[PDB]
Amino acid sequence: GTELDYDTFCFYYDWYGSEAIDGQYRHWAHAIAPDPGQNPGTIPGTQESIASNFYPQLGRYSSSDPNILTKHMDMFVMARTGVLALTWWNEQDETEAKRIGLILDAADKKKIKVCFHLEPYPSRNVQNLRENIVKLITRYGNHPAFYRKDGKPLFFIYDSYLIEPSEWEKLLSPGGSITIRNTAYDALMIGLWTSSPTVQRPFILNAHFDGFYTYFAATGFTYGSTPTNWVSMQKWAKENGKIFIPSVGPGYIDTRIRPWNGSVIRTRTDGQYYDAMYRKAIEAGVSAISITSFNEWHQGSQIEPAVPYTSSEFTYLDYENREPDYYLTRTAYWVGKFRESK
Numbered sequence: 001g002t003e004l005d006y007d008t009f010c011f012y013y014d015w016y017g018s019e020a021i022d023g024q025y026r027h028w029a030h031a032i033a034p035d036p037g038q039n040p041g042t043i044p045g046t047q048e049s050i051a052s053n054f055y056p057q058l059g060r061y062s063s064s065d066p067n068i069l070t071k072h073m074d075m076f077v078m079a080r081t082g083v084l085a086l087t088w089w090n091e092q093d094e095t096e097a098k099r100i101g102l103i104l105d106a107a108d109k110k111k112i113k114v115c116f117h118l119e120p121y122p123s124r125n126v127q128n129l130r131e132n133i134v135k136l137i138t139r140y141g142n143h144p145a146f147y148r149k150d151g152k153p154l155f156f157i158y159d160s161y162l163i164e165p166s167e168w169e170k171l172l173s174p175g176g177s178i179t180i181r182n183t184a185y186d187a188l189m190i191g192l193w194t195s196s197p198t199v200q201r202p203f204i205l206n207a208h209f210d211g212f213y214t215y216f217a218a219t220g221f222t223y224g225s226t227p228t229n230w231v232s233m234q235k236w237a238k239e240n241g242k243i244f245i246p247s248v249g250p251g252y253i254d255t256r257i258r259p260w261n262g263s264v265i266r267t268r269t270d271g272q273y274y275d276a277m278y279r280k281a282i283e284a285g286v287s288a289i290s291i292t293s294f295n296e297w298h299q300g301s302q303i304e305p306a307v308p309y310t311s312s313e314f315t316y317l318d319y320e321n322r323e324p325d326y327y328l329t330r331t332a333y334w335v336g337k338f339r340e341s342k
């Protein structure tokens with residue numbers, strides 16, 4: 001009842017900086033998004049004003065601070081989440097390479113695995129995706145923390161709908177012009193199911209994805225993130241040899257950085273929102289679950305410990321009446337219930 005679950009994937013963000021490591025509070029400082037001649041301004045990432053509606057127990061930390069990473073891996077162990085699904089932006093800079101290596105090293109000390117969450121980086125296309133999959137497997141595939149499921153790496157592909165199925169086929173069909181199938185670089189490729197089945201069923205089949213996930217922590221944001229659709233999505237997945245990895249989260253709020261986005265707020269209700277979403281994933285009969293998120297602090301979906309904080313600039317939300325580690329321990333509860341169902 002305490003072991004890590006390697007079919008549980010927690011979305012992790014490595015984009016935070018601190019003065020101690022980076023010399024700058026990266027991402028804690030963040031531009032405010034205009035509402036789709038506005039000068040919306042910027043959150044400055046001071047102690048008092050950070051780019052989240054909540055406040056981290058660990059403060060304005062650096063994702064490159066090995067001592068922070070240690071603490072994060074201990075949190076993953078508490079939550080029983082065996083796979084860290086690492087955001088990857090193809091930054092092509094030494095700081096990215098350093099951070100990835102540190103995260104792998106810290107993860108391995110606690111038997112945590114790492115897979116990549118391939119983000120919509122500039123000019124992303126199936127050719128540079130192939131080149132990047134090769135790069136990541138070549139660089140990190142022999143690291144002991146690199147995740148494999150039945151011998152294959154696994155990648156989540158955010159906003160996979162931005163690429164046509166005719167392009168995906170070239171990479172993901174066994175006959176595709178630039179296929180990874182049957183190569184040293186074959187992998188489980190998990191696309192993002194967004195909209196209705198009439199659109200998503202043929203997309204997923206014609207793209208040759210191995211599976212699909214839903215990402216959004218806010219129920220009802222998309223068809224795919226509406227949990228009453230999960231039973232039918234799982235039925236279709238099983239019928240079509242696809243792996244469904246629904247995404248569950250504890251809440252959503254991003255109004256510090258998107259003040260116009262209040263309709264997407266989902267209240268945590270002392271854990272009852274998380275409970276409801278996790279229960280629906282397990283009841284759907286799925287073989288794997290993803291958690292949005294460990295630490296997307298901008299979106300207020302994090303399970304990472306948060307503390308009460310009132311500053312001169314903002315009164316932050318917090319977990320009270322729950323303790324700061326409540327979402328870690330509640331995750332461990334649900335991992336157990338999920339394992340009971342496997």
Ligand SMILES: OC[C@H]1C[C@H](O)[C@@H](O)[C@@H](O[C@H]2O[C@H](CO)[C@@H](O)[C@H](O)[C@H]2O)[C@@H]1O
Nearest residue numbers: 011087117119120158254257296298299
């Ligand atoms: O990891 C996938 C996706 C998850 C959320 O929709 C965002 O984290 C998004 O990043 C965008 O929004 C961030 C703020 O919420 C912003 O900091 C990033 O620069 C954006 O790219 C992720 O792509």
